[PDB]
């Protein structure tokens, strides 16, 4: 009730640790590339935010920020 602005402060920490380790978002993708199918599924499931989290809140936040990235690319 009553439309308003609600935010969480600093939900995510701006690091580079997860760029060093590909496949962090998906539990199945974790534990190393035993086969090249891992390499392909790394990209095939990158934006599939549904399979990275069941929380609709986190899905929505990821969608919001991805839209900002798309706008930046268009600019």
């Amino acid at each position: 009730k009553k439309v308003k602005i609600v935010v969480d402060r600093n939900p995510v920490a701006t690091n580079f640790e997860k760029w060093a380790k590909p496949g962090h978002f998906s539990r199945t993708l974790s534990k190393g590339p035993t086969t090249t199918t891992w390499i392909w599924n790394l990209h095939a499931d990158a934006h599939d935010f549904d399979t990275q989290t069941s929380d609709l809140e986190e899905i929505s936040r990821k969608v919001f920020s991805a839209h900002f990235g798309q706008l930046g690319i268009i600019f």
Binding site: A20, P22, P33, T34, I39
Partner: protein
């Protein structure tokens, strides 16, 4: 001449082709002030074309019935006719560079195989190790012939898995 092919420096069709291609570029020139950027670009192109046609004539490439350079792919029939730079020398050059890259990759595989997580050291390359092995790969003829004379280059088929016949 090696097989009815007169040297391009003698063939009239080769010089005729030179003439025609330059004349086309001159016709393209005759539309701009000879000091504008398009005019400078056209003049540079014509200079490049003239340099190429003189370079080809100097090196004695063989032209056919048409005015186009031909190459010889037989050692001996190209070494006794002064045409070893056509296929044999680039053959050596390629074989060398290809072997260099292949040996660098092969040794990197054999170096990261004996580690904790070999499937991890293929998607996250170790750049210092890759660069060291890339530098060591330059002597690949020597090292590869050493490993063949040693028998350590290859693996006996009794240890390679095979299909059920």
């Amino acid at each position: 001449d090696v097989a009815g092919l007169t040297p391009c420096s003698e063939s009239k069709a080769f010089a005729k082709r030179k003439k025609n291609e330059v004349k086309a570029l001159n016709k393209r020139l005759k539309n701009y002030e000879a000091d504008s950027a398009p005019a400078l670009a056209l003049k540079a192109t014509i200079a490049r074309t003239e340099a190429r046609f003189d370079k080809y004539a100097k090196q004695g490439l063989l032209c056919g019935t048409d005015g186009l350079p031909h190459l010889i792919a037989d050692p001996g029939l190209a070494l006794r006719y002064g045409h070893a730079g056509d296929v044999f020398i680039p053959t050596i050059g390629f074989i060398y560079f290809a072997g260099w890259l292949g040996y660098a990759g092969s040794k990197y595989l054999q170096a990261v195989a004996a580690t904790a997580k070999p499937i991890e050291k293929e998607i996250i390359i170790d750049v210092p190790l890759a660069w060291k092995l890339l530098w060591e790969g330059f002597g690949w003829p020597l090292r590869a012939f050493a490993e063949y004379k040693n028998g350590s280059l290859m693996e006996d088929d009794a240890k390679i898995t095979v299909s059920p016949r």
